[PDB]
Amino acid sequence: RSLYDLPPYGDATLLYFSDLHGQAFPHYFMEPPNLIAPKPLMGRPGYLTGEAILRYYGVERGTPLAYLLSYVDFVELARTFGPIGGMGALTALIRDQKARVEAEGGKALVLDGGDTWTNSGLSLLTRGEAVVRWQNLVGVDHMVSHWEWTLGRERVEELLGLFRGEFLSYNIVDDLFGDPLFPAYRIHRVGPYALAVVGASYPYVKVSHPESFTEGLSFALDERRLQEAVDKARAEGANAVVLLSHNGMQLDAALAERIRGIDLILSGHTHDLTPRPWRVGKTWIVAGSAAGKALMRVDLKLWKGGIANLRVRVLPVLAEHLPKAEDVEAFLKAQLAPHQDHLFTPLAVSETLLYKRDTLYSTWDQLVGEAVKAIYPEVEVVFSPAVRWGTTILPGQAITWDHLYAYTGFTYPELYLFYLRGAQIKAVLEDIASNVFTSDPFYQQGGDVSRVFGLRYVLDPDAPTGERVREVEVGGRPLDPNRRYLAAAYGGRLQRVGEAKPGYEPRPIYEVLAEYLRSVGRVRVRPEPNVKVIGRNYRLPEVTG
Ligand SMILES: [Mn+2]
Ligand SMILES: [Mn+2]
């Protein structure tokens, strides 16, 4: 009846998005069919999918919110409402909203949760610069970071010189002296009140990406320093404190029970959606979604001691249903005009739905495994990175280079071929499983399993560490712990424990994909999950339509 036409509410409005991952154009982004959790974490925000998520939030099936929120009815709703995101539509929506708030005499802040500058055609072609420029066009007040660092320390410093907003992070410090490199927070006047925005960058940057990108930096989660920063903002006059975070929602939730003084957390990193805020301790938590699919409008009623009340609305960024942001459209045309040929020409047509997100398995990741095995038939197992970023290809839709970059646009995209003993394969899976499924609530945090094309296994998320992965089979034959298997991997560090295939030169995964796609012309990868999940129903979306 009116997704965007909202009446005024409160003293301040936060317009928040996160994990855009350089997605410049309207595209499709389906939520995961599964977000598997150990028994203790089931049924909570960050672990809800399908029908369950709709019910939890009281979202009616078939609505624009349902289209964004769940994989249920995906293909059908994508045809109905159209693509989401695009920097043009996102900008138009942010401006529409900011203009409404200011006309009400309210104070509006545009907040970016990070994982913004990277992983897209536009980003790769400009080493992130064009994304920074767009941020400057819309007018981002603050941002935090994670994948930004894959551009390397030097390049990030350069880009921050261009970024007109104020970058925040309490946790990024020099690894020798420990001095913070950036402001921990910023206090903004909101009428008679003061509202502090504290920033937190992803604390595991060092172990998640090439160490050389962050040489000289520490990103470690420091609760003592976090508390001190919150205590300081207040002593300096802050009535309410908001944490603009890239810790990940489950980690944010743990902190809400350990840190005092945080009134609201805008949770990035986990690519979650929270149509209603998640109350944890004395803190409200609102997720940043991803890929430009939504703008979270958080209206705040402040009081001398914090946040009195709040209104949260997930605003769908529907390109077909929003006005154009002319300057943005113009900037994009100017930036990618010289490369539209490369970026948008079809490489192949996908007959069925290609999706990326899921705890265990995806049709997109299988496609990649099939491409690798096709070009390198000696490869027995292909380990694909379970990143949260990517895009969704509809049936009959043509795959382009822009999609390849959205899916495999790492700054370190090299595909490695190397041998692993059978015992290593099993241990790699068991190791990931122990991270992603730890029961202990004190230790959060969730976060998907590498997809291994060429093998099948049984997973029990509730079993003890060392017993979660069993009945591993490679090509129909039981895994032989002492056998050397030829593996392929990209977007990670698995190659570090393997023996490199002689004669093989690592090259960008996307070059392998383009070669394969151009040759085959059409692909049809139906969902055939390779994992038997103990104690859970494993779900699949409808891949035709
Ligand atoms: Mn992300
Ligand atoms: Mn992230």
| CATH of residue 312 | 3.60.21.10
User: What is the CA angle 113-197-164, rounded to 5?
Assistant: 65
**Nearest residue to 3 (alpha-carbon basis) of 366, 314, 385, 402:** 314
- Rounded Cα distance between 274 and 260, Å, is 22
Q: How was this structure determined?
A: X-ray
H helix or E strand, kind and range, residue 418: strand 414-421
The 10 Å Cβ neighbour count of residue 225 is 16
The structure was resolved to a resolution in Å of 1.9
Question: Does 190 lie in the same domain as 178?
Answer: yes
Domain identity same for 403 and 421 = yes
How many Cα atoms occupy the beta-carbon half-sphere of 522 within 13 Å? 5
- Which of 345, 377, 395 is the endpoint of a domain? 345
Among all ligands shown, which has an atom nearest to the Cα of 21? 1
3-state helix, strand, coil in the chain (%, to 5): 35, 25, 45
506 CA to middle of ligand 2, Å? 26
Q: Is 503 helix (H, G, I), strand (E, B) or coil?
A: coil
List the domain range (segments joined by +) for residue 73: 29-81
Counting other chains too, the contacts that 333-339 makes at CB distance below 8 Å and 24 or more residues apart are: 335/122, 335/125, 335/126, 335/130, 336/24, 336/121, 336/122, 336/125, 339/121, 339/125
235 in the same domain as 268: yes
Distance separating alpha carbons of residues 442 and 321, to the nearest angstrom: 43
Q: How far apart are CA 200 and CA 269, in angstroms?
A: 11
Beta carbons within 8 Å of 57's beta carbon, 6+ residues apart? 69, 275, 276
Which residues 6+ apart lie within 8 Å of 215 measured at CB? Answer: 153
Backbone angles phi, psi at 294, to 5 degrees: -145, 155
Ligand nearest to the CA of 18: 1
Both 74 and 47 in a single domain?
yes
Q: Is 283 within 8 Å of 198 (Cβ atoms)? A: no
d(CA 126, CA 137): 16
Name the residue among 46, 83, 89 with its Cα closest to residue 67.
83
* Amino acid code (one letter) for 525: V
Which alpha helices (H) appear in 376-465, and where do they start and end? 401-408, 422-436
Name the domain boundary from 345, 376, 399: 345
Residue 82 tokens read as: 């159209």
Going from the Cα of 341 to the center of ligand 2, the distance in angstroms, rounded, reads 30
How many Å lie between the centroid of ligand 2 and the Cα of residue 483? 36
Residues 283 and 217 in one domain: yes
SS3 467: coil
463: tokens are 């079993």
Q: What is the whole-number distance in angstroms between the Cα of residue 281 and the centre of ligand 1?
A: 26
Phi-psi region of 82 (alpha: psi -120 to 50; beta: other; left: phi over 0): left
Residue 119: nearest ligand to its CA? 1
Place of tokens 């930004």: 148
- Counting ligands in written order, the one closest to the CA of 201 is 2
- Count of beta carbons in the 10 Å neighbourhood of residue 240: 27
- The Å distance, Cα 268 to ligand 2 centre, comes to 7
Q: Of 62, 81, 100, which residue constitutes the final position of a domain?
A: 81
Looking at the structure, tell me whether residues 95 and 76 fall in a common domain: no
Contact between residue 252 and residue 202 where contact means Cβ atoms under 8 Å apart: no
Give the distance (Å) from ligand 1 centre to CA of residue 103: 33
445's tokens: 């945090």
Half-sphere exposure of 21 (CA within 13 A, CB side): 29
Cβ proximity of 510 and 413 under 8 Å:
yes
The b/e string for 61-84 (b: 16+ C-beta within 10 A; e otherwise) is eeebbbbbbbbbbbbebbeebbbb
Is there a single domain that holds both residue 67 and residue 113?
no
3-state class (DSSP) for residue 328: helix
Q: 197 phi and psi, to 5 degrees?
A: -110, 115
Tell me the CA end-to-end span of the chain in Å, nearest whole number.
27
Cis previous bond, 445, omega within 30: yes
What is the enclosing helix (H) or strand (E) of 143? Answer: strand 142-143
Tokens coding 400 = 């382009």
- CATH number, position 61: 6.10.140.570
* CA 258 to ligand 1 centroid distance, Å: 25
User: Could you give the CA distance from residue 81 to residue 455 in angstroms, rounded to a whole number?
Assistant: 38
Return the residue matching tokens 């380990």.
Answer: 383
Give the residue from 314, 306, 315 showing the smallest Cα distance to 11: 306
> Edge-to-edge strand order for the sheet containing 522-523?
398-399, 348-350, 522-523
Tell me: is residue 115 an annotated ligand-binding position.
yes
Q: Are residues 296 and 369 in the same domain?
A: no
Q: Which residue has the tokens 């991803």?
A: 290
DSSP string, 229-293: HHHHHHHTT-SEEEEEE-S-HHHHHHHHTT-SS--EEEE-SS----SSPEEETTEEEEE--STT-
Do both 294 and 173 map to the same domain? yes
Measured in degrees and rounded to the nearest 5, phi and psi for residue 65 equal -65, -40
* Residue position matching structure tokens 């190791």: 431
Q: Is 312 helix (H, G, I), strand (E, B) or coil?
A: strand
Cβ neighbours around 179 below 10 Å, total? 7
Number of domains within the chain: 3
User: Is 19 annotated as a binding-site member?
Assistant: yes
Determine whether the annotation assigns residue 269 to a binding site: yes
3-state secondary structure 523-538: ECCCCCCCEEECCCCC
Distance 270 CA to ligand 1 centre (A): 7
Query: Which residues have a Cβ under 8 Å from the Cβ of 361 and sit 6 or more positions away?
Result: 451, 527, 529, 530, 531
Phi, psi of 33 (to 5 degrees): -75, -20
Known binder of ligand: residue 271?
A: yes
Same domain, 247 and 288: yes
Using the mean position of ligand 2's atoms as its centre, give its distance from the Cα of residue 151 in Å. Answer: 14
429/513 same-domain check: yes
Q: Tell me 162's DSSP state.
A: H
Q: For the domain that residue 533 is a member of, what is the CATH number? A: 3.90.780.10
Q: Ligand 1 center to residue 532 CA distance, Å? A: 27
Rg over CA atoms, the chain: 23
Amino acid found at 440: D
Whether the link from the prior residue into 135 is cis, omega within 30° of 0, is no
Residues with C-beta atoms within 5 A of ion ligand 1: 19, 115
- Which of 529, 510, 543, 540 minimizes the C-alpha distance to 396? 543
Are residues 229 and 96 both part of a single domain?
Answer: yes
What is the CA(515)–ligand 2 centre distance, in A? 29
